[PDB]
């Protein structure tokens, strides 16, 4: 099985500059070009470069105007990309994605890498239980920066009638929500508890919905 | 850089129907070497972008027979025969003759089904946010469907605008069904100034909307 495994969400100050990495494994590394996508907003997709892994030569979309840099090391089967002098233009999910035989055929890609580019501080967010057949809980997740945050219920144990809600922005801190749906005959006679996570601030929260 | 121009951009489409998007491009995609690097990708919800059509025609290995690719110079065509619920998705059409890649906007492709009216929940605030000064009252308008809802706030009868944030989920894969949260945040001061708190859905499925209330007194 082709993986490629790229490195986690960055938040990088206005004017300052990001190395993310994609770990290839399930092939011969040196024998595929990788290349780099952005994509803006979830939805638009533009070509950063290309690497060919065998020789170091990058090739590079000249509206980058020279800000990106790819470098490859054979023996970790990794590829990175180093992106200057990031503006909040650049705040976008980075891909890397392997070609046949290179350059062409894009064939597989890697998860995603979230950079969001900023002046402001990282926030944890202030996590708050939302306690009110079937009944509906919740966990508003509120004041935060930057994205993203992973919210689960009963560490996996809940997963059917789970529904998370897109952040919002409002004022430079996002706000989002989370929707759980259990039978009556088991809550509250059973415990439910929300968990957040937010990477660039360390935390993790667990929330127990008790009745109010 | 080749515009590549992707047509329609939204598809709604019935489980069991046919569906098509056309891809055009500003300049033709033949190369000097015979082949025309015309392919299409797929980007579902909670997934990384997968290779769906390449070489116009080829077919990925993991993709069904109900994807076709066709098309010559500088127009092509994706038909899927008839859509599935694991169809629903982003589909990008890209070029790779040209120097740089470049990728259309993408066709987002949405399902169909019977209409169903939201289960509506609300929330007061936590005693955890009051504790610490705030107030933000939720609304869930949960796994409804046509997409398009509104939602009225009322506080002590009173019909209330401002302070008002709302958040839609993309179109469920497993029940095609949305989901909408409503967010009122008051100072914790002007939450104790008042009484009732009242949200209210408004979906084509009822002449009336649905209505539900929390009292502070209760």
């Known amino acids: 099985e082709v993986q490629l495994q790229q490195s986690g969400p960055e938040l990088v100050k206005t004017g300052a500059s990001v190395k993310i990495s994609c770990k290839a494994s399930?092939?011969?590394?040196?024998?595929?070009?990788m290349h780099w996508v952005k994509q803006s907003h979830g939805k638009s997709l533009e070509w950063i470069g290309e690497?060919?892994?065998?020789?170091?030569?990058?090739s590079y979309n000249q509206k980058i105007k020279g800000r990106a840099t790819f470098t490859v090391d054979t023996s970790s089967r990794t590829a990175y990309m180093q992106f200057n002098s990031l503006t909040s233009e650049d705040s976008a999910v980075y891909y890397c994605?392997?070609?046949?035989?290179?350059?062409?055929?894009?064939?597989?890609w890697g998860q995603g890498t979230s950079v969001s580019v900023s002046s402001a501080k990282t926030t944890p967010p202030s996590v708050y239980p939302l306690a009110p057949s079937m009944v509906t809980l919740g966990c508003l997740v509120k004041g935060y920066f930057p994205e993203p945050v992973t919210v689960t219920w009963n560490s996996g144990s809940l997963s059917s009638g789970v529904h998370t809600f897109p952040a919002v922005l409002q004022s430079d801190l996002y706000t989002l929500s989370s929707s759980v749906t259990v039978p009556s005959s088991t809550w509250p006679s059973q415990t439910v508890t929300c968990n957040v996570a937010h990477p660039a601030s360390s935390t993790k929260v667990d929330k127990k919905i008790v009745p109010r | 850089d080749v515009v590549m121009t992707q047509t329609p951009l939204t598809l709604s489409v019935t489980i069991g129907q046919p569906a098509s998007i056309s891809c055009k491009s500003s300049?033709?995609?033949?190369?000097?070497?015979?082949?025309?690097?015309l392919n299409w990708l797929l980007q579902r919800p909670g997934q990384s972008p997968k290779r769906l059509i390449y070489?116009?025609?080829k077919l990925d290995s993991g993709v069904p027979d109900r994807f076709t690719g066709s098309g010559s110079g500088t127009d092509f065509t994706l038909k899927i025969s008839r859509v599935e619920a694991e169809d629903l998705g982003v589909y990008y059409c890209?070029?790779?003759?040209?120097?740089?890649?470049?990728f259309g906007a993408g066709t987002k492709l949405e399902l169909k089904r019977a209409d169903a009216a939201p289960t509506v929940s609300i929330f007061p605030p936590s005693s955890e946010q009051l504790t610490s000064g705030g107030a933000s009252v939720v609304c869930f308008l949960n796994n409804f469907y046509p997409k398009d809802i509104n939602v009225k706030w009322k506080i002590d009868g009173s019909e209330r605008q401002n302070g008002v944030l709302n958040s839609w989920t993309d179109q469920d894969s497993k029940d095609s069904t949305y989901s909408m949260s409503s967010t009122l945040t008051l100072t914790k001061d002007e939450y104790e100034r008042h009484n009732s708190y009242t949200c209210e859905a408004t979906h084509k499925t009822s002449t009336s909307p649905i209505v539900k209330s929390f009292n502070r007194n209760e």
């Open positions: 994605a392997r070609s046949i035989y290179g350059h062409s055929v894009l064939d597989y």
């Open positions: 399930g092939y011969s590394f040196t024998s595929y070009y």
């Open positions: 690497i060919n892994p065998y020789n170091g030569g990058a």
């Open positions: 300049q033709s995609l033949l190369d000097s070497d015979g082949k025309t690097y």
């Open positions: 070489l116009v025609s």
């Open positions: 890209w070029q790779g003759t040209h120097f740089p890649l470049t």
